[model samples]
Target: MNMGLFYGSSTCYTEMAAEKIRDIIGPELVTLHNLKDDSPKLMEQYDVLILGIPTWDFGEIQEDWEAVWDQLDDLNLEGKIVALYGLGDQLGYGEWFLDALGMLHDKLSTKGVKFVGYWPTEGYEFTSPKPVIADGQLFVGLALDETNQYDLSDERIQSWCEQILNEMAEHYA
Candidate 1:
């Protein structure tokens, strides 16, 4: 599949996670773009997309994503096959873990986009009273916890990649 995987990394953790995802998803099938140097126009080339974001402190969205937040409204993503992944300290900022992911998903969903890779929230522990809740079952995308559970990140990515492939096929069929 021709996929554009875009991400904004402030601490390199998000960037490294995107690399791991690219590796798992296969580099030939996906192109990685750092939001800092890339333009939104690049995304118009592919209908399959993977967007990565790391939430700032306690529910704050990443700055780079914030920069292009309004521009996303201008993109025509209807019928696009999209998946999302997010980096957060579920232990340190459990209350806001994957908040940015939900925010991104919300925006895309409003534009008639079909999203894949919804992950179960069974393993995470939320310390915040106002935690992000989507359907009360799963995060809108793959939720990676590098701070407390780095070992599981690889497994999650591999599984989520498989899931995305299946979801894309289901959507296309």
Candidate 2:
């Protein structure tokens, strides 16, 4: 699989999460691009994509993502295998946790991409404003709470990678 991961990190937590995901996928199989330093057009170079975003205060998206958000429309990702992972603090921003993930998925879904990482929404404690829930049971992507659930990230990544592989095999094996 020609894989690439694009991510935006302001405090490095998101970047660290991306690194763990890369390790799970294999360093030799994927390329890493910091959205702050790389162009969205670089995404066209990969058949499979891993996108990571970290939500800021009150559900705000990362600054780098906001800058090039609209440009995502330029990509013809009609059949790309896209997987997404997002970083949010469920404890601190309970009401808005992973909101950015939903917004990003909305934009990419319009471009005809098939998402693979539909993580369960269980075990997360929050109020009433989360926007990432899909089917009322799963988040649109893998959700990582680095601030509150640091110990769970590794296990989450490992499991998510297995899911990604299974989905890929079903679709492209």
Candidate 3:
């Protein structure tokens, strides 16, 4: 299936994480779309989509995503397969970490898309209920803390990419 990875990054951490995911999933299979330059409607072309967004200051969405937040409603995303990844500062914003990820997930949930990449919350230390799901055992998507755990980002990206691929395969089966 064709896959598109859409992301918005202010400090480039989210973009770098998107690159890592594309590399792990294979660059040829995934096309990168910078929300800074591309419209959210472009996501309609792909059967599979990976969305990357970061939590800013106190649980706010990144600027680029905030700019086109309403545009997402224009797209018909009823059956698209989606995975999400988020960048946040766990230590700095423990009460609001990954809130944007949860917000995005909730936004798209109403559209009937098949969501993959529900990640375990074992490694993270956050007080927010926004991102937690599945009775608090999982996050709505993969969560990365570049500010506090830079060393773990690459490995987490690798594992999450692999997990997404498997989940997609199982979903198709």
Candidate 4:
């Protein structure tokens, strides 16, 4: 199966997610896009697209990626499978965990692209802040403890990435 990742980020957080996919399916040609510079031609090449971004102010999208919401408005995404992933800090702002992810999800869904799913389909699900495995698809959400002052490395978050990759591989295969 073929897949690609398009992103709006300065922090390499998306790499962590990519690592999970690589660890599972042995690297499936995941592409990295700097939302800073995207073109219509670039969107035409992927079969599946993983949307990633380092959202600011809790759920706000960075300036670099804000335009993608507009570009996808008129883009043709038939026969494409898309996943949503965003990195952010709840401590920074008071929006949804990854409001930008939902925004993109809604935008793409309107354009006829089928969204694979996120960690939680609900706009804001705090009852289970952590990702849930064995959920069939990727449990897309924020990194563990992004707001904490100490180590941001959370085992559960890492596990979510790995499990998501495994599930994705099975889904595509």
> Which has the greatest TM-score?
3
lDDT for each residue of candidate 4 in 1-173, tens digit (9 for 90 to 100)? 56666666556565555454344434546655556676644775777766765556655676777766677766768767776666654454434545565566566667676555445434433333333334523344433324552264444445555644555666677
Question: How does each model score on lDDT?
Answer: 0.79, 0.81, 0.89, 0.56
Instruction: Highest lDDT: give the candidate number.
Output: 3
Provide TM-scores for the models. Answer: 0.90, 0.92, 0.97, 0.67
lDDT of 1 by residue, 1-173 (tens): 67888899877877887787778878988888888778766776787889988889778888887887777888878778889888788666777877788788878888788888886677677544332346566677888888768888878888998888778767777
Order of candidates by lDDT, top first? 3, 2, 1, 4
lDDT (tens digit, per residue) of candidate 3 on 114-170: 999997778679878988788998999998988768988889899999999888868
The C-alpha local distance difference test score for the whole of candidate 4 amounts to 0.56
Candidate 4 weakest ten by summed lDDT: 124-133
Q: Is candidate 2 or candidate 4 better by lDDT?
A: 2
The full ranking of all candidates by TM-score, starting with the best, is 3, 2, 1, 4
What is the C-alpha RMSD, rounded to one decimal, of candidate 2? 1.6
Q: Candidate 1 at residue 173, lDDT?
A: 74
Better of 1 and 4 by lDDT: 1
Clashes of 1: 0
Q: How many backbone clashes does candidate 2 have?
A: 0
TM-score, predicted candidate 2 vs. hidden true structure: 0.92
Give the range of the ten consecutive residues with the poorest summed lDDT in model 3: 119-128
Q: What local lDDT score does residue 34 receive in model 1, on the 0 to 100 scale?
A: 87
- Which candidate, 1 or 2, would have the higher TM-score against the true structure? 2
